[PDB]
Symmetry: C2
Subunit: 324 residues, 2 copies
């Protein structure tokens, strides 16, 4: 009936049109050490984050899931400010990123102590059922992530802890896959450990252009997310044209009740500002929160995708995902 947002419990039936994977803030681990030159400018950051939220609202978005990992600058209190200003529902996560873009030393050390996996489960339970730090905000999803071609031993600790927490709480799991790998493997591993496929979203699935890879993942009964719309020009990433091609094939096969769409935007980068070099910068120009609504959805409609199917993906699926 209810889901935890940054403003507290909200009825699942009130979530409405949802973006399943966007970041208001995000930083690569290590950004914290560059505080002198890469200061967090909260006022400007809030202005930018609120502007992004308003752009989403303009296209009927009422809810956003922000799965910023705990080790990547997650800031629930900041999200609450965005939500308070805009009236958007924002659902945050508990979880760590994958090894290559994460900060593994801490839980690797606890693994040497023999307690890491239990500590992670304890962290998930605390943040799902008690609150994050002193904010009073509970996470509404568990974020999991794996490496390219491998769910590492470090990563598997989180996967097992997540399955355990899910069995206890009924919490939704949202995942990151790296470079179009491990979708089927994540689903199989989570299900081995008793996780509920109807509560799992395997992310970044659109990074792989082989429809058989998607169908192998869909076979487990999980949700999949095409959540990289706008990300073009590598590393390895396919084009939006290719993403649309893959999506159309799955919709023709009747998989709409298992698919959600997003952009995985980073609206405010933590640390120093940066500029992409020009070939890449132009290829990435559509990576913003309006892209699905201005470009992608019109293209789907051009191919004959019905409004009810679009509504299934943006409204029906998040409602079902967060319902018992």
């Amino acid at each position: 009936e209810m889901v935890e947002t940054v403003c507290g419990p909200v009825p699942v039936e009130q979530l409405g049109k949802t973006l399943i994977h966007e970041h208001f803030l995000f930083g690569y681990p290590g950004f914290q050490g560059d505080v002198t030159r890469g200061t967090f400018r909260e006022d400007e950051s809030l202005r930018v984050a609120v502007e992004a939220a308003e752009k989403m609202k303009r296209h009927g978005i009422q809810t956003v899931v922000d799965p910023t990992p705990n080790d990547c600058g997650r800031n629930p209190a900041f999200l609450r400010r965005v939500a308070e200003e805009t009236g958007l529902n924002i659902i945050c996560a508990t979880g760590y990123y994958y090894e290559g873009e994460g900060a593994p030393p801490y839980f690797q050390f606890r693994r040497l102590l023999g307690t890491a996996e239990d500590d992670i489960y304890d962290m998930f339970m605390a943040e799902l059922t008690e609150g994050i730090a002193d904010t009073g905000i509970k996470a509404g999803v568990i974020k999991l992530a794996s490496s390219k071609g491998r769910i590492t031993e470090y990563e598997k600790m989180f996967f097992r802890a997540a399955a355990r927490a899910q069995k206890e709480t009924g919490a939704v799991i949202i995942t990151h896959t790296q470079e179009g790998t491990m979708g089927p493997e994540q689903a199989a591993y989570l299900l081995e450990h008793g996780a509920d496929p109807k509560k799992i979203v395997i992310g970044h699935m659109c990074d792989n252009t082989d429809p058989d890879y998607h169908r192998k993942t869909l076979a487990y009964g999980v949700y999949i997310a095409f959540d990289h719309f706008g990300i073009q020009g590598m590393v390895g990433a396919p084009t939006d044209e290719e993403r649309v091609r893959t999506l159309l094939a799955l919709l023709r096969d009747g998989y709409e009740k298992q698919i959600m769409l997003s952009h995985d935007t980073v609206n405010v980068w933590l640390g120093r500002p940066f500029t992409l070099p020009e070939p890449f910068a132009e290829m990435m120009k559509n990576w913003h929160v309006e892209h699905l609504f201005v470009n992608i959805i019109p293209a789907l409609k051009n191919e004959g995708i019905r409004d009810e199917v679009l509504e299934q993906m943006f409204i029906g699926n998040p409602a079902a995902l967060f319902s018992a």
Copy 2:
């Protein structure tokens, strides 16, 4: 001749008896993500850190160099609270840790952008000559660190930026070596990029028990630190008995003017509290700030080491190190 401390400039002639490598606070990268169960409690932490400072003061210590890396929870304002309460001089660092206990994703990303090395130099210069964040505190040393058996491409960016910053500022460089490797290589690499050997301390040298490894390093004209006293059993670490054996051999060889001693304590751990298992816990029982004075120095004097030699290491060498 002055050095920057957490309280501002202090005459080098007033540093007196110094511990070259101790941490009031330290966290393994990723500790930030375990904030809920591992919150930093400032009042209690300050009480503990102040007590550690008072323990050092009782043995005549007037100065501590705290080289906590930027990515390992460095908190200069906290150090200033400790120093303001106790009158201890505390000198802090600018730098990142080695890959295996560091947070490389941030500067790895900036390396891809082509700016990392310049960004690191910029950071070093800002923190040595202007201030850290909004604290008004300047770092007095640059902290460098390498991995086991190699200085990685990531680490080398910091090494080159450090040499550049040293040429400009005359700043002292303090290093970490991993598992008794890369001592000579660090010295060679820094001098090859124009760093001053009389301003370099190669750290954790006591983790290697081969006196030829030490003599190879010492031949570069650099300082070396036996800075792991009390750390026994963990990750290939030698015993204190073995450390004393190596140290005695070098002192009898006439190397006193190049050697400094410390414990590399962590007085307050960031993140969740932990307890070491029973075999390791007993082995680590002497890992505290009084150990050199209560146990090690008496062991050295029992082996014929005179007060003048000890004073050279604890007083003479730090004064020379920080002098032009």
